[PDB]
Amino acid sequence: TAQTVTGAVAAAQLGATLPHEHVIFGLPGYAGDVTLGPFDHAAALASCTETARALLARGIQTVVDATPNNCGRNPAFLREVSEATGLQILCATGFFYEGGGATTYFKFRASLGDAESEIYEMMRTEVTEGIAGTGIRAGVIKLASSRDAITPYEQLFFRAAARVQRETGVPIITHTQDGQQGPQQAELLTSLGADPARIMIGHMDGNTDPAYHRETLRHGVSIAFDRIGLQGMLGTPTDAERLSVLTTLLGEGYADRLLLSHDSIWHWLGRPLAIPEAALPAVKDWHPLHISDDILPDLRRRGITEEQVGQMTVGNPARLFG
Ligand SMILES: [Co+2]
Ligand SMILES: [Co+2]
């Protein structure tokens, strides 16, 4: 079964799934901006339930919320959104690339003792028992790595996650930075005995060389083109380039290892931030209805079959998260 924020759910009840999205999200530091950018709970609930309804209208029955522990993750809010709409939501346990922000805590602990075991205990507890005393369990572990390497600090989390994966069977989803380190993540996690049929290497659409994807897929893992709609921001490809690589890989029989998502943020934490005019095109399709309305029909137009589409959007998530 999949562990969702409203309880366990049968694999066959997951339905069409978006496997990497952010219902709410804050970059590390947002909490320090609380005076002028506090959480507007009513406004967030309204906006997020509206979005959940739009997804349910499109046949989407489950979303995997990939928000790390230090980026504003809020299981009780996700449960409110789920209970209000019927949309099934899985949440994550993990911390963001370091790299990234809010890293000083476990880096310091690592310097003074066995941080891997501490991380392992957090992950295990949040997967098996619950988060922050609420009884809401994480349904996926979230890992992230930097662009130029999986750093020794980041590896603490990879080794702790592999251990929890061996003991519980929990799925693992990842973040890759600027289209790098996919093969290394897959190789590291598999070498540690993690189950490749429960690993989704993320942000693989960030690289436009099919050979990079094929190398990752070699480890038996799945890969997600999960920032679909985010176009030419800070090195991201366009969707057209994404789909060009995807059609190639589909044509090589990889449909049962490919997944699709947006990495969208439905409500931003902190003060609202205005998108500069020049950047509007990059973010225009970066929202969770884009795959349903624009992408899937475009793949069908291209000769991708209904069976293949259902494999990416329903078959694979059932197997990976269920
Ligand atoms: Co990410
Ligand atoms: Co993300």
Distance 182 CA to ligand 1 centre (A): 13
Q: What is the DSSP string of 100-128?
A: SSS-HHHHHHHHHS-HHHHHHHHHHHHHH
- Beta strand 2-4 with 7-9 is antiparallel
Q: What is the DSSP string of 184-244?
A: HHHHHHHHTT--GGGEEE--GGG---HHHHHHHHTTT-EEEE--TT--SSTTPPPHHHHHH
Distance CA 213, CA 312 (A): 16
Spell out the residues 6+ positions from residue 163 whose beta carbon is closer than 8 angstroms to its own: 120, 192
Judge residue 107's burial from the number of C-beta atoms within 10 Å of its C-beta, 0-12 exposed, 13-18 middle, 19 or more buried.
middle
Distance 87 CA to ligand 2 centre (A): 19
C-alpha triplet 38, 70, 204: angle, nearest 5°: 115
Q: Which two tokens stand for residue 165?
A: 């994966």
Distance 112 CA to ligand 2 centre (A): 30
Cα–Cα nearest to 52, from 39, 65, 34, 70: 65
Distance 71 CA to ligand 2 centre (A): 10
Distance CA 157, CA 171 (A): 14
Closest ligand to the CA of 146: 1
Residue 7 phi, psi dihedral angles, 5° rounding:
115, 180
| Count of CB atoms situated within 10 Å of the CB of 24 | 22
262-297 b/e (C-beta count within 10 Å ≥ 16 → b)? bbbbbbbbbeeeeeeeeeeebeebbbbbbbbeebbe
Distance CA 96, CA 146 (A): 10
Resolution expressed in Å: 1.8
Closest ligand to the CA of 96: 1
Q: Which two tokens stand for residue 293?
A: 């309305």
Cα–Cα nearest to 318, from 52, 16, 6: 16
* Number of domains composing the chain: 1
Distance 236 CA to ligand 1 centre (A): 12
C-alpha triplet 26, 30, 31: angle, nearest 5°: 115
Distance 203 CA to ligand 1 centre (A): 7
Residue 20, marked binder:
yes
Q: Which two tokens stand for residue 228?
A: 């679909």
Distance 80 CA to ligand 2 centre (A): 21
Distance CA 50, CA 41 (A): 14
Straight-line distance from the first to the last Cα atom of the chain, in angstroms, rounded to the nearest whole number: 5
Distance CA 197, CA 175 (A): 17
Residue 133: domain span: 1-322
Q: What is the dihedral of CA 211, 212, 214, 215, to 10 degrees?
A: 110
| Residue showing tokens 């449909």 | 255
Closest ligand to the CA of 97: 1
**Biggest CA pair distance of the chain:** 57
CA distances to 62, 63, 165, 180, 205 from 221, rounded to whole Å, are: 21, 20, 14, 16, 15
Residue 175, marked binder:
yes
Closest ligand to the CA of 67: 2
Contact 33, 21 (CB under 8 A): no
Q: Which two tokens stand for residue 25?
A: 């999200």
Distance CA 269, CA 292 (A): 26
Distance 175 CA to ligand 1 centre (A): 4
What is the CA 193 to chain-centroid distance, rounded?
A: 22
CATH code (residue 294)? 3.20.20.140
Closest ligand to the CA of 24: 2
Residue 263, marked binder:
yes
